[model samples]
Target chain A: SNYNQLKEDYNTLKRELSDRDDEVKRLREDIAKENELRTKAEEEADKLNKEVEDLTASLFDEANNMVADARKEKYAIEILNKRLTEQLREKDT
Target chain B: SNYNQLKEDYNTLKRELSDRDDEVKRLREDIAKENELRTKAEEEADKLNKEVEDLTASLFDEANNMVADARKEKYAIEILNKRLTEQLREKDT
Candidate 1:
C-alpha cells in the first residue's frame, strides 16, 4: 500500500509539472506575439515621421519662395511709384 | 515514508511555482519596456504636430502678405490707366 501511494503521488506530481510547463509555453508564445506587434508599430511610426519631415521641408521651401516673390514685387512697386511721381510733377509744371 | 513522499511532492510544486514567477517577472519587464517606447513615440508625434502647425501658420501669413501686395499693385495699375486715358483725351482735343 505504501508503494502504491508513492507511485500515485509521483504521477500526480508529474501531471502538475506538465501543466506548469504548458503555462510557460503559452506565456512564451504571448511574449513573442507582443514583441512582433511592438516592432510593427514602431516601423509604422518611423514611416510617418519620415513623411512629416518631408512635408515640413517642402513647406519651408514654399515659404521662402513666397517671401522672395513678395520682395521682388515690392521693388517693382517702388519703381512704379517713382515714375508716377515724376509724371505728376511734369504735369503740374 | 508517506510524509517523505508528501515532502518531495511539495518541493516539486514549489520549484515549479518559482519558475513561473520568474517567467512572469520577465514578461512584466518586457511590458514596461514596450510602454516606455510607446510614450517616447507619442512625444515625438507631438513635436512633429507642433512643427507642422508653426510652418502652416507662417505660410498663411506669407500668403496673406502676397495678397495684400497684389491688391496694392492693382490699385497702382488702376491709377496709371486713368492717367493714360487723360493723356489720350488731351491728344484728341
Candidate 2:
C-alpha cells in the first residue's frame, strides 16, 4: 500500500512538472517576440534619422540660394534707380 | 482506517497545490517585471532616436548652407576675374 501511495505521488509530481514546463515555454516565446519588435523599431528610427538629414540639407541649400538671389536683385534695383534718376535730371536740363 | 489514509492524501495534495500556486504567482510577477522593463527600454530607444535625428538634421542643414555659400563665393570670384580681364584688354588697346 505504501508503494501504491508513492506511485500516486510520483504521477502528481510529473503532471506538475509538465505544467510548469509549458508555462516556461510560453514566457520564453513572449520574450522572443518582444526582442524582435524592439529591433524593428530601432531600425525604423535609424531610417528616419537619415531622411531628416537629407531633407534638412535640401532646405538649407534652398534658403541659401534665396538669400543670394535677394542680394543680387537688390543691387540691380539700386543701379536701375540711379540710372533712371540721372536720365530724368538730364531731361530737366 | 481508510478515512485516515484519505485525510492524509487530502492534506498532502492541498500542500502541494498551495506550493504550486505560489510558484505560479512568482512566475507571473517575473513576467510582469520583464514586460515593464521592456517598455522602459523601448521608450529610451525612441528618445535616443529622436536625438539622433535632430542632431543629424541640424548638421546637414549647416553643411548644406556652407556649401551653397562657397558656390556663391566662387561665382563672385569668376565675375571679378571677367571684369579684370575686360579692363586689362581695354588698357592694352
Q: Is the docking of candidate 1 incorrect, acceptable, medium or high quality?
A: incorrect
Off by over 4 Å in 2: A46-93, B1-37
Model 2 per-residue lDDT at B16 = 68
DockQ, candidate 2, comes to 0.09
**Superposition error at A78 for model 1 (Å):** 4.6
Alpha carbon deviation, residue B24, candidate 1 (Å): 0.8
DockQ of prediction 1: 0.21
Tens digits of per-residue lDDT for model 2 on A64-93? 676667567556655655555454555556
Per-candidate alpha-carbon RMSD to the true structure: 5.2, 10.1
| Top candidate (TM-score) | 1
Per-residue alpha-carbon lDDT of candidate 2 for residues B29-78, written as tens digits (9 for 90 to 100): 77677667667667876887768756876776676666667556656655
Give DockQ for candidates 1 onward, in order: 0.21, 0.09
Tell me the spans in candidate 1 whose CA falls farther than 4 Å from its real position. Answer: A1-23, A37-55, A77-81, A84-93, B1-7, B66-70, B73-92
Task: Please tell me which predicted candidate would have the highest DockQ against the true structure.
Answer: 1
Question: Lowest summed lDDT over 10 consecutive residues: which window, candidate 1 chain A?
Answer: A84-93
